[model samples]
Target: ANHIQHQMVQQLSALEKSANGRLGVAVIDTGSGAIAGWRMDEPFPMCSTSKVMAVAALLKQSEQTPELMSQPQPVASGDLVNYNPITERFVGKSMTFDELSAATLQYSDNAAMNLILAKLGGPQKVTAFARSIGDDKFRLDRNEPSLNTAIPGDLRDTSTPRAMALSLQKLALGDALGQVQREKLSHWLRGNTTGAASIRAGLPSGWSVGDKTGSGDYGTTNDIAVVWPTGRPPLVIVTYFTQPQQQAESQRPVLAKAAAIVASHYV
Candidate 1:
């Protein structure tokens, strides 16, 4: 490990909560191509954080098919995805592509994600979109589950810390999207209310953070973001940690502390 990676692992080693769990964190200096963090090559379940990739894909698609954004998509009762708080309320209704995109990115809305997935040509299309944007290693193999489905412990989306950070960097830098599309992408992500106690928790008051978070079966707790430090260049961060408890509330402080440590190293 490099100095910053050594420092990050030391920081994680110091955290009381992560003593029994394993986590991967990566930080990138956008200007210099410098990357550092521990366990960055390990595959981690991204949970709902994968939504941003789907949104970016749709936004990029909108560049060629302008109507993809304005079209209304239907939500049959059978198609509604249930766990998310943002789009659950509209389970049996219809949503415009724009609304579904916003709901998927901002709220990590499962139902909205399902609709968007369908619009963008299902899981394979999303996966293709991911590759098109340079996320060759990230996987979106399964769709968001409905209420009655059973999710096996091993059946989940996964990404390496490096790929996660790189995907966010590509999205943030607009490598696959136009200016208007990128702005819309950032707007939705900036409004994300999930992971309040994770990456966003450790940021300084003046820092600008736009991110997406995910939590699910087993101890999965993940967050990835493009963070703009006050008066400094922006950075991309991907942090994934696990806990014995399924909800992983105990992992919050670990993520917060780790984020602060990573941020401090960038300076």
Candidate 2:
């Protein structure tokens, strides 16, 4: 594991020189508890990746009453609807807790997330949950107001590759969350539909990735994920590119290339 991590780090050092913008990464080996990664001095926006914390909050709440996990709530309709951005003008639709979580996690649906946040007691609750587990670096920021207003100065939701890697490690070890909840979270991550292009691009045939991708116009593009090769254990990988005022499709390729380099050492 040490050799593999060393090799992976060396490869990333080379890639960083030519990357279009500032980049940060965190990779963890689930089986060995060893970590391999990097983070640039500049902070990177987390984007929708914050939804993962929302999921954790929901699961923690359901722990008190497991039935809440399956109960259906009214799927809200109108401007305040859970997933729709334009609905900012109206009230949100109601949906079951399960539905809201599934939509928010699987599809990265903003409306579903907003509704879930309301049910779980808003962003404060979510941020509290993450901090409880020692992830004090992550904080929730409102994105609906302005694109330029949300960037972190030092480390406010501006994730370091190391923090993300540790978070994934805890999730895998069922340390940050319970066993059932960890499995459920992993399952939901496996179904992630967004940010697939970059992280999923470099993998051996049939090897699966349990991960999430995040992007916004916060002068950064980021992807935080755990890659699970077919037979090997999982590896947490976080990639961030800062200074790009727009989401660059080209940066996506860099993640794949980085994944390929990392995978070669582990797989």
Candidate 3:
């Protein structure tokens, strides 16, 4: 391990000691390509964080059929699911792919994700797209709400911190998707309103961030981000935390603290 990696493992271990359950983290410095983690290979429920990749898959498809992005997509009441703040308003109406993508990315809207996933041929296509990007650890077994089951030890709809961060690095900062599509994705992420107190809150002043967050039963709260410090390149960070207790609250502070630790090394 490099200096930052060694320090992160120790610091993150100390940070996780008082937590109720496991915390998995992965950090990659884009400038130096150095990486760090704690239990980064272990599985944790993805929850709504899967929305990022769902959009990625759609963006990949749009590379061939560019019209798919601007085309209006119909949303019926049958598509409604829990946590559909953005989509609920559009029930029986229609939303373009751009609107649905914004809903999912900015609000983590459940209905929006399912509709987009359905259009992309379902969760398996998202998994296929992950494989195409060199990420074999990510797998989406179901759609929203169902995939948010988040059983403590169940592996369904789970992904390792390392794999998730790598995919974010590629999709957000690397060349996994076309420039326009990836830029649009990043714009939506930067405008996210749901993660105010998660990783975004932990960032120091002058640093920029674009992130996606997920929460589920058993205290599962996850955030993945591409962070750019003032004078250096961006860093990809993934923090996934799960408590053994059912229906526990999301740990935004813990996630923020984890981001703080990773940032101290870079900034």
Candidate 4:
């Protein structure tokens, strides 16, 4: 082989420079078993990304009592928290487990997520679910708002890019959850309304994108996605970006750029 540098390696490096922030990315081509990554081992605050796990844990438990999916649970005023677009609307009413799962995954509803976590006893149950699925690196320790701390050097409530991608692969494509629950999870992921400026913006026309996003303190932003490119196998792409200092700007452009670079290589 010649001494030519891999284009992706160079572009990924440049992508990091362009953002002036740390970035972790991992892409797994489910069909070909191909993997590509940049800083995939580093832990980053999970923020709202762990919402998927909360829903997944509930879905896993529902395997025995399928009625749990449709059972209506009351949504108290105390459950409503910051950034809850969906759950805030029904504070006094009751919603099914499936409905709350959709609100958490698709709308990133904070109140809805806490409601699910309450049902599961806390964030540890989600971590247990991750362990049950053979993922030791993914962990969630706190509920929303507090969980979005994103403190530097803190490992609590964080997941590595590689682990996040693999865990999502297992839930979305593998047998980690039952067939119906898997489809339900995938449906909620696809219905996410928060990724317009994130990874989905970079994918080519006709490619399908299902993603979960996280945004937190210290300028942290993350997106984990299962994308279906035209004529190619589905791919799981996870990106996390954060600067040492707090900044108000969104990291979506950087994540989208990373998405384009990674997708070009696979497609």
* Residue pairs with backbone overlap in model 1: none
Instruction: Please give the lDDT score at residue 213 for candidate 1.
Output: 84
lDDT of 4 by residue, 1-267 (tens): 111137877898898998888899898988877777888888999899999888999999999999998998998888888888877777779899898999899889998898899999899988998999988998899988899888889999999888898899999888999999899999889989999999998889688889999899988989999998898889999989988786555688999999998888877
Candidate 2 vs 4: which has more TM-score: 4
**Model 3's lDDT to the true fold?**
0.89
Candidate 3: minimum summed lDDT over ten consecutive residues — where? 1-10
Candidate 2 residue spans exceeding 4 A from truth: 1-7, 40-42, 77-93, 143-156, 246-250
lDDT, candidate 3, 1-267, per-residue tens: 433566778888888887777899888988888888888889999998999999999998999999989998889899998888988998888999999999999999999999998898999999999999999999999998899888977889999999999999999989999999899988888889888888988888677789999999888889999887888888999999988888788888889999998888777
Candidate achieving the largest TM-score:
3
Worst 10 residues of 1 by lDDT: 146-155
TM-score of each: 0.89, 0.83, 0.97, 0.96
**lDDT tens digits, residues 1-267, model 2?**
232355666788788777756667666777887766655323567776777777878887787788887875554453243345323323443456766666667766676677677776777777777778787676665532232243445344555566656666676445777778888888888877766677777777587777776656545556677677777776787776665445444367777777777677667
The residue pairs in collision within model 4 are none
Candidate 1 structure quality by residue, lDDT tens digits, 35-128: 8877788777778888888888888889988887987776766765556565666666667889888787777778788878877888788888
Instruction: Choose the strongest candidate by lDDT.
Output: 3
| Per-residue error (Å), model 2, residue 69 | 2.4
Candidate 3 stretches with Cα past 4 Å from truth are: 1-4
